[PDB]
Design an enzyme around this catalytic site. Structure first.
Site, PDB file in Angstrom:
ATOM      1  N   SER A   5       0.807  -1.219   0.000  1.00 53.07           N
ATOM      2  CA  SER A   5       0.000   0.000   0.000  1.00 53.07           C
ATOM      3  C   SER A   5       0.841   1.270   0.000  1.00 53.07           C
ATOM      4  CB  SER A   5      -0.959   0.016   1.190  1.00 53.07           C
ATOM      5  OG  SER A   5      -0.249  -0.115   2.409  1.00 53.07           O
ATOM      6  N   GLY A  23      -2.017  -4.402   0.821  1.00 54.55           N
ATOM      7  CA  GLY A  23      -2.156  -5.629   1.632  1.00 54.55           C
ATOM      8  C   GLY A  23      -1.207  -6.752   1.248  1.00 54.55           C
ATOM      9  N   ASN A  71       3.146  -5.731   5.792  1.00 54.97           N
ATOM     10  CA  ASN A  71       1.896  -6.507   6.017  1.00 54.97           C
ATOM     11  C   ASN A  71       2.200  -7.758   6.849  1.00 54.97           C
ATOM     12  OD1 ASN A  71      -0.371  -4.917   4.984  1.00 54.97           O
ATOM     13  ND2 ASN A  71       0.780  -5.039   3.080  1.00 54.97           N
ATOM     14  N   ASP A  82      -6.813   6.620   9.293  1.00 57.17           N
ATOM     15  CA  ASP A  82      -7.718   5.606   8.768  1.00 57.17           C
ATOM     16  C   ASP A  82      -8.018   4.571   9.844  1.00 57.17           C
ATOM     17  OD1 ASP A  82      -5.145   4.269   8.568  1.00 57.17           O
ATOM     18  OD2 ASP A  82      -4.976   5.110   6.552  1.00 57.17           O
ATOM     19  N   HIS A 115      -7.049   1.415  15.870  1.00 56.15           N
ATOM     20  CA  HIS A 115      -7.099   0.211  16.733  1.00 56.15           C
ATOM     21  C   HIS A 115      -6.733   0.614  18.151  1.00 56.15           C
ATOM     22  CE1 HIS A 115      -5.637  -1.931  12.923  1.00 56.15           C
ATOM     23  NE2 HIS A 115      -6.938  -1.753  12.934  1.00 56.15           N
TER      24      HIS A 115
END
Length: 190
Positions: A14, A51, A82, A163, A166
């Protein structure tokens, strides 16, 4: 200037695909423009796939190379982030990257490796093991290395897209404290 453009393969995830950005804003596109200031007219193949793990990159490297009308004159390899995000074995990431670099070396394509760094969430043992795969690979495969590709944004949260959000374990406790009343009220009394 005279001549056809120099072909560079940008093989990554990405961070090369330009996730969250508009047309022409990705790293390969902006790098292509910046190279003009180094006396270089490049055509940078954007082979970034959002990804992609090291295994995914290994699965497609031959196809990507065989798909090119013009053989790359430099391959920039940017993978492993990733694998970190999935908590995967650093040793396996090193092995997968080795297979990518071996294919490029077989074809005599020069390599620039973009070094990835682990955040402290997985722990010092994992972080030291993951971080060390890049200098190891650069030495083994005679590749040039950018030690820390994301260094220039490392201290710049204003230059990082918002974005994924978490929460940390402590952040989860914060969410629980804010929402438990609503959950208790929504549950039918016994």
């Amino acid at each position: 200037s005279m001549g056809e453009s120099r072909v560079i393969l940008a093989f990554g995830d990405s961070l090369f695909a330009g996730y969250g950005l508009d047309k022409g804003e990705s790293y390969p596109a902006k790098l292509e423009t910046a190279l003009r200031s180094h006396g270089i007219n490049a055509r940078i193949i954007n082979a970034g796939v959002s990804g992609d793990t090291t295994a995914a990159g290994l699965q497609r490297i031959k196809f990507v190379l065989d798909s090119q009308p013009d053989k790359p004159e430099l391959a920039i390899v940017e993978l492993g982030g990733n694998d970190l995000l999935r908590g995967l074995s650093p040793a396996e990431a090193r092995q997968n990257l080795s297979g990518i670099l071996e294919e490029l070396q077989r074809r005599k394509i020069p390599i620039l490796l973009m070094g990835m760094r682990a955040p402290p969430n997985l722990g010092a043992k994992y972080q030291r093991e993951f971080d060390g795969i890049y200098p190891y690979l650069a030495e083994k495969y005679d590749a040039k290395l950018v030690p820390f590709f994301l260094e220039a944004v490392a201290d710049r949260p204003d230059l990082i897209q918002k974005d994924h959000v978490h929460p940390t374990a402590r952040g989860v406790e914060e969410l629980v404290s804010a929402t438990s009343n609503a959950v208790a009220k929504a549950l039918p009394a016994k």
